[PDB]
Amino acid sequence: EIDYKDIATLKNYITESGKIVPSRITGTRAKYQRQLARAIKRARYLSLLPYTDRH
Amino acid sequence: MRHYEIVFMVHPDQSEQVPGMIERYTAAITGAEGKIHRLEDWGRRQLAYPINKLHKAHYVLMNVEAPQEVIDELETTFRFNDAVIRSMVMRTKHAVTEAS
């Protein structure tokens, strides 16, 4: 359901240095976090999101 | 005969050829009884990180439904086309036509 192109919402679940925020903090469900991570990694590959703050 | 989602970024200097490539790629699938369910030209966008000493790329979206061979034979063309860099394809179960 979570789409990697839905780029506006992705910063809500990543930090400044590109860290993926853990579910314990964001409170997202386990199922959604798994697909969320896939979306984030997918976006990073397309240069839509940064892997880290250093490039 | 499955649903596919195709994203490919081209060299910014080739921003004037993107309409041509879309027609050729669309023609190839439509010739094999396929049909395009979504087409979107996202324009030149800022890259999150540089690729090959390059910072701006032209983004487009292409969600299609076609047989195995036409995408498989389309991938090889993507490889040797220097204009396009870092293309991706995906598998989907249902056709989607949203603005996104």
Added chain:
Amino acid sequence: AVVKCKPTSPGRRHVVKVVNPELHKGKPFAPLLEKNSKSGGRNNNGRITTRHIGGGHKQAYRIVDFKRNKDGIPAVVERLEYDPNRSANIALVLYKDGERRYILAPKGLKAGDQIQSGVDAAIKPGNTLPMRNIPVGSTVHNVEMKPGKGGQLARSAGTYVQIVARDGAYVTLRLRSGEMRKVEADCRATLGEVGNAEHMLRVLGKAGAARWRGVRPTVRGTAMNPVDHPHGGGEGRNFGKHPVTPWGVQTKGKKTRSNKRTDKFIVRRRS
């Protein structure tokens, strides 16, 4: 395939053969053959110039198209056949205009496959294009040193050349030996590796096997007398000398290349 012979007799225990059922069992293409005679290592003066050459089975040369200048005419692989003159096999191709030629068989080529040569040819094994149009990082074989001169690199059974960089009018090639060399982008190359990669797994098994292919015995320098070889003799087995060639040049380490003409194209040596 590689088959180990059963030890039915000495000289057959250790023999390992390379069997390719796809090779043509019949006679070669007669109009594309010519006679080549054995020299025995003798030059025009009659002196033995290179040693350990002599005898062996009679062989007939076959004109192999090393240039591949037939541009824009597709051809079909008629058959693969054995080539006594080289480690690799040769694929007989038929251009649809009615002309037949011999080419080195690539890794995956088989009878009936489509092959095309030219600047606009598709990127498939067996197709010949200038390295200018060939994408970088692609494996190629039968590379020409000069445009139009014919391929001279990666002609052996399983050899190949990797295109690593393309800068301006020159392409840097990773040769099979490990040395990096610069060649003009206008030179042609054939996509894909050379076929019959199992040629290195065969074992002759017996002394006569080497003789069949014109390799005469090699005599060690230690067993020589001082007059014949620098290693000389000595009562018993005495060496006490730095190893050298039979003409006194030090071997086993001494660099020998002295070509100042083309060291410009050698970006990096093999080691």
Added chain:
Amino acid sequence: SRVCQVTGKRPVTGNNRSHALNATKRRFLPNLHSHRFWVESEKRFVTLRVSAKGMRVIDKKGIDTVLAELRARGEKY
């Protein structure tokens, strides 16, 4: 035939002497080179086997005068 076509220089034989004055026969041969000189009169390039000294002779006398001597000697060029 390592002979200059202009000055007629040919290899000559001498011996090289070491510090102990040992004499071993040797040969002195000229600085012949293959060079082509334009003939301003005939609009064509002429190539002949000449030495460094011979080139200077052509420089001083001129190519046109030099080829005249070769014709007199019957040497083909």
Added chain:
Amino acid sequence: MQVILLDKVANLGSLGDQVNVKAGYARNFLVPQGKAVPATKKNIEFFEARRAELEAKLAEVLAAANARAEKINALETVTIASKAGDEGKLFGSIGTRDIADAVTAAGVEVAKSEVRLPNGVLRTTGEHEVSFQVHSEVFAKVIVNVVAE
């Protein structure tokens, strides 16, 4: 070497000067060309009688070249065809001979040796600029475009 210049040379000197140069420079370049001749008493007297007309004649050669340069410059567009691939990438190339023939075809006769291609060999489609050297002191320019189907 001491030589007599028959034409304006870029850096060595001007017409009629007596300036020494390297033997190789005069032997292999100036003498085979018309730029200069060896400096000897024989030619010096011949030069003096020939001095008046050579200076006058060399003025007409660059005048025709300048006139021919304008004629070349008049044809501001030349169209050539070649093997053009996808996204305008040509598999082949457009050599100096190809561009030379185009200008003479229904145009002005231009030698193959006066075409200048500093940016390369025009291996890409579109329109590019090519320069010619009709004479040592004149220039010609024109836009050249290649298209094919």
Added chain:
RNA sequence: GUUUAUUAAAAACACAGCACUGUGCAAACACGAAAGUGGACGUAUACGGUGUGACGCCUGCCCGGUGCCGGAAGGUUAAUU
């Protein structure tokens, strides 16, 4: 299998196999004052040299000496000036 034709046929030589090393093609190398020729109408799964000598289990330590390879700031150093 080969060898001292005519006192030595062998444990000697060769051998398939193994290893080191050279060689990017106008290859190294070799015969030639040179042209040229062989290597090879072959192209590093190729070719030359060297040692070992099927196969099986293995092949330890030492780079001071000699040789080779790499670098070379410095010292010393030829013709020439």
